Design a protein around this ligand. Structure first.
Ligand SMILES: *[C@@H]1O[C@H](CO)[C@@H](O[C@@H]2O[C@H](CO)[C@@H](O)[C@H](O)[C@H]2NC(C)=O)[C@H](O)[C@H]1NC(C)=O
Ligand SMILES: *[C@@H]1O[C@H](CO)[C@@H](O[C@@H]2O[C@H](CO)[C@@H](O)[C@H](O)[C@H]2NC(C)=O)[C@H](O)[C@H]1NC(C)=O
Ligand SMILES: NC[C@@H](O)CNS(=O)(=O)c1ccccc1F
Ligand SMILES: NC[C@H](O)CNS(=O)(=O)c1ccccc1F
Ligand SMILES: NC[C@H](O)CNS(=O)(=O)c1ccccc1F
Ligand SMILES: *[C@@H]1O[C@H](CO)[C@@H](O)[C@H](O)[C@H]1NC(C)=O
Ligand SMILES: [K+]
Ligand SMILES: [K+]
Length: 501
């Protein structure tokens, strides 16, 4: 509908520049007729989700690389894609003028944008906050009579969530996660540092903490927001670490098991919010499968846990087959969901690299890895940051797919935004991953899914410098002759006519 306005900041690719009167956008989503495919292309050279169409052909005479769709080989159903409405993201979005705020939110949540259908909401403050607070800071209030939402929620986050929901045609799911409890429930009496809930699961401290979740859901329900899921704690391993710099609450896996079994599971199930799903872990994948074994081999905890939330720190390496693969093998009925991903977190990495194609490729490669290892969704971290990668009260700056520059009333869409978009826009909730088989060894990364209405989507990532000709075969439909240019990502969509073999 409106093309990217590119700008270079001296990194490998460009950002797209948006402001109070202009942002790139798509037309309303339409499928090509039977016999035609749609291709959306982004390239390092600067193409940004450019649409082209081609014929599906009955015949293929070539002998080069063939990717054959396996539409009856079915894997996981997809919950969706989105990102996090932290205090930092809310402050950056609202620092824009109302026209630019609108264009930013449309970029993410509308059908003329990339179709996000998940928002992660911190329960009170985290590092991406400028004030440290919980919802029940008044000490020894075990019945939580003074629980209440501050303006960070009522004036910033809740109104923005409502605006996102109005722009979305897809139903949006909210996920909530706490970082710290009130300090009077913790062993160390501080929001950060090494410390856990006082006492033992099943006691007053633990019962109060579980009740805080229900008060949170109650308070958001007064504002007409309902949650799809909650996690039992953001990064429970972090609060076991001496000197941890920001809000945390430490649980060993046995502690989380007992908390869920004795306190959180029973309290949620006894509430009006009993349909809210509970996700365990909410931490890095190398804690799996150990954490899953500890929690899910206890039948009393197991009966409360709907899924396992995992974090992706894209600056780091970790095995996927031994963590996500093994967890799926051992616990195939417990969904895996990626609840946070970020890049640029190491202190020595420039937090915001405007126009980094490499960070874009890290994002899409991670998403493909995630989907090939049975994960049902992918959630980015902060929806928007400033050019420092903040604000952040401990200076823990990081990158974001949208960077806001208040001094120019401008925001910049990073390659990461488009890499994520190649998935979020084209994979509706309820899509199912299907198999995709290469005829010969090759350098491409790819994934195939089927929409709820039977349509096909294939994402093809080329992290190499070399242009790779290829053909996609859909046994029921025909052949798509294409090329994967060096340093590109493509999404292919087509309708699948009924066909008998
Ligand atoms: C927002 O950005 C747009 C796009 O860059 C600006 O519009 C451009 O302005 C230059 C300078 O006058 C023109 O030469 C271009 O033709 C314009 N392009 C388009 C597509 O309109 C616009 O001025 C900016 N708006 C604000 C409020 O700063
Ligand atoms: C389970 O939830 C019910 C909600 O009905 C709680 O029952 C109420 O508890 C409050 C005090 O906490 C009383 O003022 C009400 O009279 C109770 N209502 C009824 C209908 O009995 C109950 O406390 C919860 N149980 C837990 C958390 O163990
Ligand atoms: N030509 C295939 C090869 O390049 C690997 N790509 S892949 O199969 O898509 C893939 C598998 C596992 C994790 C991430 C991945 F990207
Ligand atoms: N994982 C979420 C947690 O709130 C920490 N925020 S962060 O963006 O991941 C991060 C940034 C900089 C340095 C270290 C970090 F962990
Ligand atoms: N429209 C949102 C829907 O839930 C799925 N969208 S879609 O089918 O992948 C699509 C098709 C054509 C053009 C753009 C698209 F996004
Ligand atoms: C495909 O091949 C066969 C001939 O072997 C025939 O159906 C047709 O001529 C070819 N072309 C198309 C577009 O079907
Ligand atoms: K309060
Ligand atoms: K950094």
């Amino acid at each position: 509908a409106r093309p990217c306005i590119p700008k270079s900041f001296g990194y490998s690719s460009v950002v797209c520049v948006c402001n109070a009167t202009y942002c790139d956008s798509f037309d309303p989503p339409t499928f090509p007729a039977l016999g035609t495919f749609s291709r959306y292309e982004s390239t390092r050279s600067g193409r940004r989700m450019e649409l082209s169409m081609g014929p599906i052909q009955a015949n293929h005479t070539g002998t080069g690389l063939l990717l054959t769709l396996q539409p009856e080989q079915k894997f996981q159903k997809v919950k969706g894609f989105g990102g996090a409405m932290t205090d930092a993201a809310a402050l950056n979005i609202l620092a824009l003028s109302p026209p630019a705020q609108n264009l930013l939110l449309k970029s993410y949540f509308s059908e003329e944008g990339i179709g996000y259908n998940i928002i992660r909401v911190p329960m009170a403050s985290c590092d991406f906050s400028i004030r440290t607070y919980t919802y029940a800071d008044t000490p020894d209030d075990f019945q939580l009579h003074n629980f209440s939402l501050p303006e960070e929620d009522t004036k910033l986050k809740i109104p923005l969530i409502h605006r996102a929901l109005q722009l979305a045609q897809r139903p949006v799911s909210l996920l909530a996660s706490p970082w710290t409890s009130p300090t009077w429930l913790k062993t160390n009496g501080a929001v950060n540092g090494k410390g856990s809930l006082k006492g033992q699961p099943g006691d007053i401290y633990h019962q109060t903490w579980a009740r805080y979740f229900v008060k949170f859901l109650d308070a958001y329900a007064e504002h007409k927001l309902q949650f799809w899921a909650v996690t039992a704690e953001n990064e429970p391993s972090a609060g076991l670490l001496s000197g941890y710099p920001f809000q945390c609450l430490g649980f060993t896996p046995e502690h989380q098991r007992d908390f869920i079994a004795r306190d959180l599971g029973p309290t949620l199930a006894n509430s009006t919010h009993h349909n809210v799903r509970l996700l365990m872990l909410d931490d890095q994948r190398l804690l799996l499968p150990h954490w899953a074994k500890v929690v899910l081999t206890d039948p009393e905890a197991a009966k409360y846990v709907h899924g396992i939330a995992v974090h992706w720190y894209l600056d780091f390496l970790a095995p996927a087959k031994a963590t996500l693969g093994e967890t799926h093998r051992l616990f195939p009925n417990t969904m895996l969901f990626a609840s946070e991903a970020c890049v640029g977190s190491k202190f020595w990495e420039q937090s915001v690299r405007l126009g980094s194609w490499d960070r874009g490729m890290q994002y899409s490669h991670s998403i493909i890895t995630n989907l090939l290892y049975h994960v049902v969704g992918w959630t980015d971290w902060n929806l928007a940051l400033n050019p420092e990668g903040g604000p952040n009260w401990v200076r823990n700056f990081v990158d974001s797919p949208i960077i806001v520059d208040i001094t120019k009333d401008t925001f910049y869409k990073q390659p990461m935004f488009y890499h994520l978009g190649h998935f979020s826009k084209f994979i509706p909730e309820g899509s199912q991953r299907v198999g995709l088989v290469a005829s010969q060894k090759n350098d491409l990364d790819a994934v195939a899914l089927m929409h709820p209405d039977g349509s096909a989507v294939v994402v093809v990532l080329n992290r190499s410098s070399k242009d790779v000709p290829l053909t996609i075969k859909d046994p029921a439909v025909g052949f798509l002759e294409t090329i994967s240019p060096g340093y590109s990502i493509h999404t292919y969509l087509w309708r699948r006519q009924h066909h008998h073999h």
